[PDB]
Amino acid sequence: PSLRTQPSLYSGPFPFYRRPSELGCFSLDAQRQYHGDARALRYYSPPPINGPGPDFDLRDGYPDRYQPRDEEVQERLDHLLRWVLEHRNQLEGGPGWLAGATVTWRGHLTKLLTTPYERQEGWQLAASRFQGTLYLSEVETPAARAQRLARPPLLRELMYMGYKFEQYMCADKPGGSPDPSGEVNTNVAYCSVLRSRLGNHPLLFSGEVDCLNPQAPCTQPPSCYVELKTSKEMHSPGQWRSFYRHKLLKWWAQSFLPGVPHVVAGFRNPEGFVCSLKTFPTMEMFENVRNDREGWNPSVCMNFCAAFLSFAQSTVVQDDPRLVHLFSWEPGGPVTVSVHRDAPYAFLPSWYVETMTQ
Ligand SMILES: Nc1ncnc2c1ncn2[C@@H]1O[C@H](COP(=O)(O)O)[C@@H](OP(=O)(O)O)[C@H]1O
Ligand SMILES: [Mg+2]
Ligand SMILES: [Mg+2]
């Protein structure tokens, strides 16, 4: 009952990954309330050309204008499940497409993609099959939970600075000027709901989207979306090389799955200011490591992910929303499976199960 993760096992040709299409969206407001619309979407608004360059003081507003989301509340798939409930009769494909699909969060798939190269943080994924559909929901590991409650001040401030960068680069209205005098409230989120397919595995997943570029060439989502990122300033080829090997892998995996074509990075100096920007097209990120003996390979990422979905599908035989197959993985080891029922691992809520049953 095990799945190996070594990169050399997955080194063949790039598998088929269907162009993702956006089926819908939803927003979570400042009170973490769900709305089935795009009210939370912000608009890409980078520093005006022929004006002063970026000069963003991410160290502005922390912590008195910071309203961090309560991470103790474990929402699991609940918001995505509400979207599915409100769109189940109106999904594309045809009869029984949902019954053949795997439903999860984009970030869960990102963790699968990076697993062959990940050497720091393990994970756990709870799986339940219900009306044919395979649902995947991450479980916080004991080490992750302990790390979270013991987050050092530096890490808490670094997390704020990543969200603060968005406030310098986005506006509430197209063409608007970004307003950093306000609050960073990380309850607020705009999520895109996407359909794709990896190999023979249809996928339905949602992902948080940083902003929309109204000047983007392609007007149809997800091609108009932009991912915003921060990273430390780099000054030597060796620093850039380490960035290419480790960070860009994570950025690629996150933006490749939903079809977000550009990541815009602000580089922060040690005093907390962003004074330079650079755009990384998702489809060109691998070029930085293609001829690197210590690089990553997107074919390995996707072939492993396909192998895991096959492994999970074959492992979860029983159609039962109270039954959970927990997939556990630590760096260097295989993915292992354990079986559980009801609390605490069961994650499909009665309100979803009963509505789908009726
Ligand atoms: N797994 C994680 N652990 C701790 N902080 C995280 C995190 N994922 C995201 N963050 C914070 O959320 C911000 C927005 O995420 P995202 O870039 O994916 O849109 C991140 O900014 P950065 O990505 O610039 O570090 C980071 O500050
Ligand atoms: Mg984001
Ligand atoms: Mg971002």
Describe what this molecule looks like in 3D:
It is a single chain. The protein is of the alpha+beta class. The protein has one domain. 25% of the residues lie in helices and 28% in strands. The chain contains seven helices and 19 strands. The chain has helices at 78-87, 106-114, 142-149, 153-169, 237-256, 298-315, 350-357; strands spanning 2-3, 21-28, 34-35, 43-44, 56-57, 66-67, 102-105, 123-130, 133-139, 170-171, 184-185, 189-198, 201-208, 211-212, 225-232, 262-268, 273-281, 323-329, 335-341. A ten-stranded mixed β-sheet has the order 1-19-18-8-9-7-13-12-2-3, sandwiched between helices. Helix 5 links the parallel strand 15 (225-232) and strand 16 (262-268). The chain is globular and about 60 Å long. The chain binds adenosine-3'-5'-diphosphate (A3P) and magnesium ion (2 copies). GO terms for molecular function: 5'-3' exonuclease activity; magnesium ion binding; mRNA 5'-diphosphatase activity; mRNA binding; nucleotide binding; RNA NAD+-cap (NAD+-forming) hydrolase activity. Adenosine 3',5'-bisphosphate binds at residues 159, 210, 254. Keywords: Exonuclease, Hydrolase, Magnesium, Metal-binding, Nuclease, Nucleotide-binding, Nucleus, Phosphoprotein, RNA-binding. Mg(2+) 1 binds at residues 166, 210, 227-228. One of its GO terms (biological process) is nuclear mRNA surveillance.
